[PDB]
A paper describes a structure:
Bacterial DNA gyrase and DNA topoisomerase IV (topo IV), both type II topoisomerases, responsible for the ATP-driven introduction of negative supercoils into DNA and ATP-driven supercoil relaxation and decatenation, respectively, are validated antibacterial targets. Gyrase is a heterotetramer of GyrA and GyrB subunits (A2B2), while topo IV is a heterotetramer of ParC and ParE subunits (C2E2). We have developed compounds with a promising activity against Acinetobacter baumannii and Pseudomonas aeruginosa, which are both on the WHO priority list of antibiotic-resistant bacteria. Cocrystal structures of 1 in complex with Escherichia coli GyrB24 and (S)-27 in complex with A. baumannii GyrB23 and P. aeruginosa GyrB24 revealed their binding to the ATP-binding pocket of the GyrB subunit.
Having worked for several years on the development of benzothiazole scaffold-based GyrB inhibitors,9−19 the introduction of the carboxylic acid group to position 6 and attachment of a benzyloxy substituent to position 4 of the benzothiazole scaffold led us to the discovery of 4-(benzyloxy)-2-(3,4-dichloro-5-methyl-1H-pyrrole-2-carboxamido)benzo[d]thiazole-6-carboxylic acid (1), a potent gyrase inhibitor with excellent in vitro and in vivo activities, demonstrated in murine dermal and thigh infection models, against Gram-positive S. aureus as well as against methicillin-resistant- (MRSA) and vancomycin-resistant S. aureus (VISA). A crystal structure of compound 1 in complex with E. coli GyrB24 (24 kDa amino-terminal subdomain of GyrB) obtained at a 1.16 Å resolution provides evidence of the inhibitor binding to the ATP-binding site of GyrB. IC50 values for the inhibition of E. coli DNA gyrase-catalyzed supercoiling and topo IV-catalyzed relaxation of 1 measured in gel-based assays are consistent with those determined by high-throughput microtiter-plate-based assays. The compound does not stabilize the gyrase cleavage complex and does not show significant inhibition of ATP-independent relaxation (IC50 > 10 μM). The pyrrole NH group is involved in a hydrogen bond with the Asp73 side chain, while the carboxamide oxygen interacts with the conserved water molecule and Thr165 side-chain hydroxyl group. The 3,4-dichloro-5-methylpyrrole moiety forms several hydrophobic interactions with the residues in the lipophilic pocket of the enzyme, namely, Val43, Ala47, Val71, Ile78, Val120, and Val167. The benzothiazole scaffold forms a cation−π stacking interaction with the Arg76 side chain. In addition, a salt bridge is formed between the Arg136 side chain and the aromatic carboxylate group of inhibitors 1 and 7. In 1, the nitrogen of the benzothiazole ring and the oxygen atom at position 4 form hydrogen bonds with a water molecule, while the phenyl ring has hydrophobic contacts with the side chain of Ile94.
Residue numbers in the entry: 8 to 98, 117 to 218
């Protein structure tokens, strides 16, 4: 299972434009955010998520936080690791593509009364998903640092590109609240049809 996962991550890194879009003109870079957001939108479509928060951090990482069910955390029997880790690492291109093309990715899940956290580097988990505390909230937070071994030329997120797509998704999923926050300059928008 471990050997197949590393090979799948490698397949994405070998042909990244094919999975995420052009890696030099900023298309693929912004599609990384859109893939994560799309998973949060799917959680809204299923009737669980009401609010999505997208943050451009000061270090040009992006986080997406939802208030959905939380990715399942229990051990998946075939692989012997958390279901969350399987979803994050086994190949709508799937969040595993974003993980494969991220120098670092942080996952925080609130589910069944617990907070769970895991860190990845180039898709490789640094430790098993672990409990960090108790919570009465539910949801998923993914923060990723795009790999500059993949993304060239356009490496800094464009607020306006994200804002336009999130406004579209708020209109097309009326009822969902989407917040966009830029920690680089303090800009914020709230989209809620
Ligand atoms: C920001 C974000 N949110 C999510 C997310 O909420 N995904 C979820 N998938 C799931 C989920 O999906 C499991 C799954 C679906 C398709 C393929 C493999 C596993 C199941 C259950 C459940 O049964 O309670 C809950 C959730 S929440 C993802 Cl993935 C990302 Cl990235």
């Amino acid at each position: 299972s471990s050997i197949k996962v590393l090979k799948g991550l490698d397949a994405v890194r070998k042909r990244p434009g094919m999975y995420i879009g052009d890696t030099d003109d900023g298309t693929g870079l912004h599609h990384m955010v859109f893939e994560v957001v799309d998973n949060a939108i799917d959680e809204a479509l299923a009737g669980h998520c009401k609010e999505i928060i997208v943050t451009i951090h000061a270090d040009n990482s992006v986080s997406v936080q939802d208030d959905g069910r939380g990715i399942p955390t229990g051990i998946h029997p075939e692989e012997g690791v958390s279901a969350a880790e399987v979803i994050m690492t086994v190949l709508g291109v799937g969040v595993s593509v974003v993980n494969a093309l991220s120098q670092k990715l942080e996952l925080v899940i609130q589910r069944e009364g617990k907070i769970h956290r895991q860190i990845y580097e180039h898709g490789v988990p640094q430790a098993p998903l672990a409990v960090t505390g108790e919570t009465e909230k539910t949801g998923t937070m993914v923060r990723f640092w795009p790999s500059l071994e993949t993304f060239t030329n356009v490496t800094e997120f464009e607020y306006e590109i994200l804002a336009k797509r999130l406004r579209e998704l708020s209109f097309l999923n009326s009822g969902v609240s989407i917040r966009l926050r830029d920690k680089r300059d303090g800009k914020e928008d709230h989209f809620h049809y």
